[PDB]
Structures are given as structure tokens and as C-alpha cells.
Amino acid sequence: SALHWRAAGAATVLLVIVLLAGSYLAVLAERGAPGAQLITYPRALWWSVETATTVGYGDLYPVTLWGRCVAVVVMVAGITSFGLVTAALATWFVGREQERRGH
Amino acid sequence: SALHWRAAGAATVLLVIVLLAGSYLAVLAERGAPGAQLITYPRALWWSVETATTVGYGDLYPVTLWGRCVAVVVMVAGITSFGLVTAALATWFVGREQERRGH
Amino acid sequence: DILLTQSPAILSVSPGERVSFSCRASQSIGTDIHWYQQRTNGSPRLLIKYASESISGIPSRFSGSGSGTDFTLSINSVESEDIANYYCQQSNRWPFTFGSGTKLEI
Amino acid sequence: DILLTQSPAILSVSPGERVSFSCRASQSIGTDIHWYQQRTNGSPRLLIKYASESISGIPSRFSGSGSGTDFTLSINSVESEDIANYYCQQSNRWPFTFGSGTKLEI
Amino acid sequence: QVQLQQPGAELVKPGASVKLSCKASGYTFTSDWIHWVKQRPGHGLEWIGEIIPSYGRANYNEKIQKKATLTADKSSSTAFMQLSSLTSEDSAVYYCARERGDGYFAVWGAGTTVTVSSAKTTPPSVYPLAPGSAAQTNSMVTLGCLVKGYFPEPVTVTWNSGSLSSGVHTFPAVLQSDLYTLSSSVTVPSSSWPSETVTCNVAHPASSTKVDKKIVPRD
């Protein structure tokens, strides 16, 4: 099993860990901030997914410094993760294209 | 016709299937949730497109667990699909750049 | 749940005169308002969809305008066959809801 | 901070009749409203969550409806054991807040 | 076509239940939702609930006592509404309507009158109403027929199996000792009767009865 597939697998596991830790820590950052909506675990988890995929729905977002710090890590993990799957598919196609010219 | 072009083609067909199935299933998930707006087919289809392209307009989004589960699949299909077109173009340019050095 | 207010309940007009029925939503619903006519002992009949769109089969005499919260169904030159109850209905948010109705009286 | 208004404060009904308690939020809170019963000298007891969801242990007689700002807890056919104060509580925005309460009187 | 066919009436004892039917025709899509709407006499439209026949999922009005259960039969294109444990609160016209998943009720059924009552079904008696001998005729003449001692509502009166529509009044029933009575009126040019025939047709869905009565001059 090639590096690029191990890495994509790793990045998926690591992103799901980031989405759960992020759920938990967003609620922990945002409770105590009057007006905050990112304060129960289930919608925190939905929030973490729409943040990682950079969907920017705009139904939920953090209003505190530590919530926003948590948000930044989730976004970076999401963009890296999905970038790494792209790199992995590039490698696969470059390989399949070497072979298809008998290199 | 090279793998990377077959694959991009495949991913486009598969994404359009995901956008239609997703339209239908979002409405089916979200009707019965008081306050839900993602409850007619046409705007469900617009919703599925703005989700797949991760535009995050914020005019329509799901409020139920199964709508959000549907939303996640649409986002992943959209980011994978568009990542795969990127990989496909990388392969094309790497090839055109091998030839341009007589490799 | 969205409340649709149709005031007044009764609207008197003279023959051939223009008439406007009002429908107010408790929050913005864009143009997701549809209008039905129900004559005595009859079932409802769709007249106007999405606030302003014609249905084929409906006299040109009928029209609709509005967006957000304030919606109007209009009849240019009323006539006897227009005597009925007129209802509005939203499809912006679940569940669908109906206005309490306005009777036209000539 | 979200204000929950429960009007009226007291609600009189005859035995076996249907009763509706109102809870109004000062801004939209979707379906993040939960309802508690507190009998004389008793602690609160969760009846309905997220505006409409059953709790196991609670008589089918109890139900909830509403979204946004306007919420209703209903009892089909009231009986003596229903005599209590009924409170609503929001979880949309920090901090959580309670309605001022409505007494049921038979 | 008639897109949605509902039975004219159901009588139901208090406490009892009833299944209303709604047989669809014209175009059917996977996307189609069938809705049910309650209208109490002199009151407005109340959304009861929805089902998607292709998947069989149903949603209900939370704001009202759940009386209903929605099912559909994919094969026979029929949607059902099981109303259970009824009382006189539940006496009303129940419409079914079809929505293409785009938000508006394109088409409605004719509606089922559900009456909750302990009283027996009774077909009506139909009586002619021809003028007396001494009544002077204008250019027009007025004829009618008297539909009395039926239960429950409704009845449908037509003239000349529906071909006579201009000049027709049907009065709302009045209710007296658990039996309804109404009358209907028809005006035709005085020349055209009795040389041209005039027949009232009286359908009473609850008793599956339809009767004709010719209006002839008094002998």
C-alpha cells in the first residue's frame, strides 16, 4: 500500500479526530459568551464539518477568541486533508500515465 | 482516452447523480422539521450545487440530522470531484512537460 | 410556524371595480405565496403561484404582487363569478400554512 | 439574552378539556425550547424537548409545537395530576433562560 | 379528467375511526406529495398532513391533536387517511390535494364530508314543486324539488342530469330532529315547460342513493 493512500487514510482519521475534538472545544470556548449559538455538542459537530469543508453556510460560527482559534485549526485540517486526497489522486494518475507510455 | 480523463468524466456524471439524489433526499429529510426551508425540489437542487461547490451562500441549509448527513455526502462528492479535475489537469501538464524535455 | 393574516375578512366592491386582497406573513417568505379561490360548496382552485405567476385556465383579470411579508391578489373589473372566499398559502418553511380567508362581496 | 414570555400566568380549564400554554421568545430560536412541569414542593420535570419531542415516561396527553418565536405546550384532556406550574427554557443562545411560568388551574 | 377522487361522505359513530381514500390519476412522479386539508363548516382550511407515496414517509401538523395516520398504495395510486377516535370536533370536509414538491396545491379532490353522530343514515324523500293551478306565468316560470328527512350531509341536486345550470338555486340544509331538509329552485322560459322536460336528480352519497323526479304540472 503506497504512501499517498496511507497518507489519505491517515488524513481522514486525523480530520475526524479534529472534527470531534473541535466540536467539544468550540462548545467549551463559546459557552459564557452572551449571544453565542455554538454551545451544544451535536450542532457543534455539524459546525465542525461545514467548517472543515469550508461550506460557510452561515447558520453557526464562533464569537470568542478561543472559538475562532479552534475554528482556524478545523479549517486548516479540512483544507490540508482535502488537498492531500487531491495530491494522492494526482500521484495515482501520473503513475497510470507513466505505465501507459511504457516508462 | 487516458484514465485521468475517463475519471474526470466519471466524477462529473457521479456528481450530477449525487446532486439529484441529494435534492430529493434533503426535501425528504427536512419536511416535518418546523422552520425548515430546504423542502421543495427546485431550490433543493440549487442548494445541492452551492453545497457541492462549497459556495456557502447561506440562503438555504438543512436543520435535521439526515439532512445534514445528506449535506456531508454532497460536499464530499463536490470537493472530491473538483479535486479529481485538478489531479487530471496536473497529469496533463506533467505529461506535456515530460515531452517538452524529450523524456 | 408562519402565520398568514388576511385582513379584512370581507371586501365589498361594485361591479367592474378593481379589488385587492392582502396577505401578511409573520416573517419574510420571499415569493413563496400561492392564492386559491373557493366558491360556495366548491373545492379550492389555485389562481396565482409564487406571488405573481399566472396559471393557465385563470382569467387575465387576476394578478398577484408582493414579496417578503406583504402580498396582494388583485382582480381588475370584478364580476359575479368572482364571488368566493380567497385564501393565501406559504411554502417557504415547514409546515405549509393557510391564511384565514377573505370573502368577496359585490 | 433571550427573554421567554409565558402569557397568561394562570390558565383555568374544566376537566377533560384541551389546554395550550404559550411561550414567546424575544428573537428566533428555531426549535430549541424545552418544557418542564413543577408540582407544589416538587422539582422540575422535563416534559417536551426541542419544541415537540416526546420524553419516555411522559403521558401521550402532552405535546409541543412551534418554531422561531411562538411555542405551545398542549395537554389533550386535562386531569387533576396536571395541576402544576409549567416553564419553558431556551438553549439556542448563551445563557440558557427560563419563562416566568404558567399555573394550570382546573 | 378528475385528477383526485374522494368518496362524497362517511358517517362515523363517536369514538369509532374511519379510513378516507384519495385515488390519483393524470401524471404521477416519484416527487409527488399527497396532502390532506380539514375544513369545518363556515371555517377555513387547516393543513392536516402530507405523505410521499413513492417513499411512504408522512408528516403531520404538530399544532393539532394527532387524529390521522397516512398510508398510500403504490400499485392502486391511492392515498389513505385513518382518522381514529373521532368526536363532533372532527365533523368536517376533508380535501386531498396533490403537490409536485414545488409548494402549491395544483389540484384538489372534491372532498369527503365526515359526520360524527350516533344517528342512522336515512336517504332523502324527493318531492316535486310545480306551481298551483291559480298561479299566473311571466316569460319565465320557477320549479323546484324538496329533499327532506335525510341524514347525514351532503346531497347533490342537479337539473336534467347536469345540462341545466343557469337559473338554479340550492338552499343550505336546515337540521330538525336528527334529519336534514333542503329545497332547490330552477327557472326556465315559461314556453319551454312542460313541453321540454325538467327533472331534478338527487344523489345522497352516505346511502349510495340517487333518485330522479320529473316536475309535471299539477293534474
Alpha-carbon distances of C100 from B6, C23, C93, E43, rounded to whole Å: 57, 10, 18, 8
**Resolution at which this structure was determined, Å:** 2.4
Query: 3-state DSSP call for residue C68?
Result: coil
Side-chain-side CA neighbours of A95 within 13 Å: the count stands at 8
Going by C-beta distance under 8 Å and a sequence separation of 6 or more, which residues neighbour residue A102? none
Distance between CA B47 and CA B30 in Å, rounded? 13
Sequence-ordered strand ranges (E) for E110-208 = 112-116, 125-129, 140-150, 156-159, 168-170, 174-175, 180-189, 199-204
Query: CB count, 10 Å around CB of D16?
Result: 10
Chain E, residues 83-112, CB within 8 A of chain B, namely 100-103
E145 has which bridge partners?
A: E128, E184
Query: 3-state DSSP call for residue E187?
Result: strand
Distance between CA B66 and CA B49 in Å, rounded? 18
Chain A hits for D93, Cβ within 8 Å: 34-37, 39
Query: 3-state DSSP call for residue A103?
Result: coil
CB within 8 Å: E65 and D72: no
Which three cell numbers mark E170? 340550492
Query: 3-state DSSP call for residue E164?
Result: strand
Level-2 CATH architecture, domain E125-214? Sandwich (2.60)
Distance between CA E81 and CA E20 in Å, rounded? 5
Going by C-beta distance under 8 Å and a sequence separation of 6 or more, which residues neighbour residue A25? A66, A70
**Quick check: do A and E touch, 3+ CB pairs under 8 A?**
no
Burial class (CB in 10 A: 0-12, 13-18, 19+), B84: buried
Burial class (CB in 10 A: 0-12, 13-18, 19+), E134: exposed
Contact A36, D94 (CB under 8 A): yes
Distance between CA D31 and CA D51 in Å, rounded? 5
Going by C-beta distance under 8 Å and a sequence separation of 6 or more, which residues neighbour residue C52? C31, C63, C64, C65, C66
Sequence-ordered strand ranges (E) for E53-139 = 57-60, 68-73, 78-83, 92-99, 105-108, 112-116, 125-129
| Dihedral, CA of residue A15, residue A16, residue A20 and residue A23, to nearest 10 | 60
Contact D55, D75 (CB under 8 A): no
Residue with cell 362517511: E10
Q: Which of B24, B32, B42 sits opposite E59 (nearest CB)?
A: B32
Distance between CA E170 and CA B3 in Å, rounded? 76
Q: Which of E44, E63, E110 sits opposite C87 (nearest CB)?
A: E44
Q: Does residue C28 sit at the D interface (CB-CB below 8 Å)? A: no
d(CA C56, nearest CA chain D) in Å: 36
Burial class (CB in 10 A: 0-12, 13-18, 19+), D43: exposed
Query: 3-state DSSP call for residue D53?
Result: strand
Report the side by side order of strands in the sheet with E68-73: E4-5, E18-24, E78-83, E68-73
**Identity (one letter) of the amino acid at D37?**
Q
CB within 8 Å: C43 and E95: yes
Domain ranges of chain E: 4-116, 125-214
D20 has which bridge partners?
A: D74
Chain D hits for E66, Cβ within 8 Å: 63
Q: Does residue B31 sit at the E interface (CB-CB below 8 Å)? A: yes
Residues in chain E: 219
Nearest to E49 by CA among E41, E39, E38: E38
Query: 3-state DSSP call for residue E97?
Result: strand
Residue with cell 409548494: E103
Level-2 CATH architecture, domain C4-106? Sandwich (2.60)
Going by C-beta distance under 8 Å and a sequence separation of 6 or more, which residues neighbour residue E80? E19, E20, E21, E22, E70, E71, E72, E73
Distance between CA C7 and CA C97 in Å, rounded? 16
Chain B hits for E50, Cβ within 8 Å: 31
Q: How far is CA E145 from the centre of its chain?
A: 19
From E60, which residue of chain B is nearest by alpha-carbon distance?
B32
CB within 8 Å: D64 and E63: no
Q: Does residue C100 sit at the E interface (CB-CB below 8 Å)? A: yes
Helix A65-99 with B3-30: angle, nearest 10 deg: 140
C5 has which bridge partners?
A: C24
Q: Does residue D94 sit at the A interface (CB-CB below 8 Å)? A: yes
Contact C64, C52 (CB under 8 A): yes
Which three cell numbers mark E49? 398532513
Distance between CA D17 and CA D61 in Å, rounded? 11
Output E162-165 pairs: Cβ under 8 A, ≥24 positions apart: E162/E201, E164/E188, E164/E198
Contact B2, A97 (CB under 8 A): yes
> Which chains contact A through at least 3 pairs of Cβ atoms less than 8 Å apart?
B, D
Residue with cell 387575465: C60
Q: Checking DSSP bridges between strand C70-75 and strand C19-25, what pairing results, if any?
A: antiparallel
d(CA B72, nearest CA chain A) in Å: 7
Contact D47, D57 (CB under 8 A): no
Going by C-beta distance under 8 Å and a sequence separation of 6 or more, which residues neighbour residue E89? none
> H-helix or E-strand containing D12?
strand D10-12
Could you give all domains of chain A from N- to C-terminal order, each with its CATH number? Answer: 1-103 (1.10.287.70)
DSSP D31: T
Distance between CA D103 and CA D99 in Å, rounded? 12
Query: 3-state DSSP call for residue A44?
Result: helix
CATH 3.40.50.720 fits E4-116, yes or no: no
Distance between CA D85 and CA D44 in Å, rounded? 9
Distance between CA D21 and CA D64 in Å, rounded? 9
> H-helix or E-strand containing D102?
strand D102-105
Distance between CA B69 and CA B43 in Å, rounded? 18
